Symmetry: D4
Subunit: 168 residues, 8 copies
């Protein structure tokens, strides 16, 4: 029901609904910016064929970026990237024991020929992958360009408004 | 004089000519794909004002991506991204002692609000940042989409042609 | 032409001929033990369809193990295992900067449901994956059990024969 | 009382009953698949002679795999493997301070001659060691082959059934 | 309101009020020692222009040290140091997933030309940056020299007064 | 009052009463084995002179081992060792952010000439340092030799008595 | 004979002449800036009394900073700082196996109460510790402030002069 | 033939003659101090039974310490310690890819009950393990106490004699 669109510009993928705690931060940004999007559970290891199918159809469906979150032996971003030339934006989800060090290594260290744009471990990287998608869309949209400029100014204002309290 | 253009679509920046050994791999991809580009030495720490000026002007100049390489306490990608909404693509350059672990941390771990798309440590990341820039351009260019598709066919063919010799 | 068989029991795969320096150590064990084998270049990222096709066909072809080596964002073992129930034996190949730490994380940290048996970084792991494949065959082969036992006696004798020289 | 069998095919060993929180996930898989098994506390450091005896007897008793978990200076899998040619499947149990990095290093880094198939840190690796054991058994059992294929399809269906909720 | 002065000798900066939990330990020391100080939220990424302005003005305002805390891709201390020759004292704030390893790398690994004096991860480093500031001021103040000597003796007395209880 | 003796054979030192949570495990072993001991707060950084004094007097007082715990930039074991030839047994106490990785590096990595026998991070290393002290004392005491032999047999019995419960 | 002064403002210390390859970079800066300095071999572990004597006398002798380099279990900076209130500037020297990771932990992770200002691993940190000492002197010297400003202009000019060559 | 004694006080063990490059540094100290010693190749994985036999016999043979070097999944020190109450002194030998990080984890992280005294990675640790053995013997030998004291005087004198040359 939720997170569907007939003409999405950004897809948000993850291997499990357990990743939603992190990946929902990507979706929050896309909603805030009014970007047509979809969010789907697509597992590299449990849904390998479906992963390949998604990547194959991405460009013809009009996707401009795929945001993909994964943890541990995190293969979903790199394997999507292997099967489409549409930009893939990888979000390392923190793992229980290695705290996303494994996730980060498995995503960022792509060999020459198949890039994955990688962001910070966890909720920061999820939000930033979405913001980065908006920066891609702003390359040919005054609306997204304007919204991103306004977002930065608002962020700057919010930092100015912060207050440090007296020592207790 | 080398690496200038009157209308670049991608800028390739680094803090020192010592970084060229890595960053030349990005320039090689841009030349191969026929992407108008510029390459410049812009140091976060020795040229802070110049860094800010470059980022300020990137959007009005028509840049569609800035590829930025740095090592150690690698601040150039993040501080460019702080000052422009043009996509910033960060390449960790390996450091002498920590082998780019410091570089990678310094670039990828950006807090929410100011994204840097991060690629592999070293030459692989430099080439991939450039290939990723081409994917960005392919969002609204059939020519760049076709060039990427042809590149991938060539890559696949080259992998098929590889040979494993007898044990010696 | 080198490294083919009409009825292999073990397949040795790697993403590039550059991995042969490590993966040849697996092939040496297989030859020593008289195990019918094939060795092939199959890249997760440059040959994704071919990788899936190889895994799909592994069981019907009679393969009892697939030894797969990869480095960096090492996806080949995990994605083979996503597509076959034949045992997959992963060999992390050392990477230029991270020395196989990235390779190891990328292979061993598979989530529940899709196992990869992982061995040491480099040449030791390649030789051990092959020796482990022989242990798998020894489950229902007295011949292979006997060969392993004889290998271990030779190993033990070789250790006993080692000599520690005078200080110089 | 629990976890005994007169003709086990898989042994599940650990140094302490404190390791049961992790290793019970191996036993759950073995039960689900109907694999005859035993689970025992066998400590490398507090029961060294008993560890040797277990390994010595494994093949003649009909064990096809030994799943062994250990944490810290984790020696149990490698020392079992030194004393039997039956497949040894090592599970790094996370340690209090190093979160299983020490465990992983102590298990996976076996030198050439004595392999240990290593799986992910913690409960994922325990479950996967057991799944891998089932894959070994499927090499000569249609029942285990069928059960494993059915398991994979069930996992795929479960991923398809996952739902991402609306933002709250 | 709080943490202002018309003639501060030490500035305490951080990217967010969320960093106060750590950086308040710097302020506690400055208060205890009677050092005129100010504390301000100045974000490298959300307030880049303001960061440059602060550094530009530091010497002429009479600042003798700037204590700056940041976490993750921690750029605030190094970018302040790029824009002033007043001593910059960097405090790595621990990050959620990497526990300040990223913070430390991003601060301490400055290349030749632009130093940042770096202290321990977290509250210990915040307190110590402030103590170090006092040591700088003691170079031309008998009052600060005396206070620092008295502090050290008091610390020594406090350690002498510690009691180890009986086993319970 | 507690943890004094007129003729101790082992001293247990730590920089703060906060280390007692860990170091009390050393004292528990020494009490169990009936070893004359003392435990004292001696800080490398807050009590440097007192640390040197303790080490200077150790041999003439009859100490046979000094167990020293420290965390972070952990200098107490190495500096005791610099000032006495009596065996120094170092226990890395886990730090808040780096979980004792820093503690371990600062203790174990002593250069040639001044050894520190180093044990596991935390309570395990504290207990083991004390057990190791007993092994030193057993070199010339049948009583300590016997007690250590009996301890090992009891440990073996305790491991035998462990029970793995049914799956719930 | 080399590296002495009757009235040094900065002392450069290291545990061995083998550290000179790194620490000479500090001395080069001090010479360039005309800072009266001394350089000495003072080992924490082989010369512990001498280290304490040096720290004790630092303040009365007029020293404004002590630059101290050490590697491995690097105790020299911290133990100097335990014994003087003169600013101590620590330089981690890379170690053979751990590449200065151990050195860095050992120096930077000082507990509250005894600060060490820590710089980058190796030659960069040595040069920066010296440049930081000049910043300390610039607090109450127009001459040293002027020299720093001129250094930064030269740095900036040198960066502008760098050239990126054609691809070969 | 080299490195034998009819009444050794220290045994120096390693899993391969390849380890001699490191372990010879221990033997050099033993020879210098006149300690009766033996050195042997005893492999945990290739000679498991022989390892157990050596440890079983160590105490009745009069050994006062066993120095054991190993790398990678380094089990030799721990498994010796599991089988004897004679002090075991572990030397991590650097591994090809992980540079002894694996070796160190595998040796130092022993659980409560079975201690291994651990020294630095490589040659420094081998020399120090031997020096530590001499400290053990010094507990009830005035000759060995005097030899250690003389060694330390020599070390101190050698440090004083070191010279720092002019800048080139």
């Amino acid at each position: 029901t939720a997170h569907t669109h007939s003409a999405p510009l950004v897809g948000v993928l993850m291997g499990s609904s357990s990743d939603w705690d992190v990946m929902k931060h990507a979706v929050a940004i896309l909603q805030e910016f009014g970007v047509p999007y979809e969010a789907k559970v697509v597992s590299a290891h449990r849904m390998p064929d479906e992963m390949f199918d998604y990547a194959e159809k991405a460009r013809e469906r009009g996707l401009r970026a795929i945001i993909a979150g994964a943890g541990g032996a995190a293969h979903l971003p790199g394997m999507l990237a292997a099967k489409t030339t549409v930009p893939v934006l990888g979000v390392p989800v923190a793992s229980k024991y290695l705290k996303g060090v494994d996730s980060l290594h498995s995503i960022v260290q792509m060999p020459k020929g198949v890039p994955v744009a990688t962001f910070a471990i966890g909720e920061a990287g999820a939000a930033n992958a979405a913001l980065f998608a908006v920066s891609i869309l702003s390359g040919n949209s005054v609306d997204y360009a304007n919204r991103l400029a306004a977002f930065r100014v608002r962020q700057n204002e919010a930092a100015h408004a912060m207050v440090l309290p007296p020592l207790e």
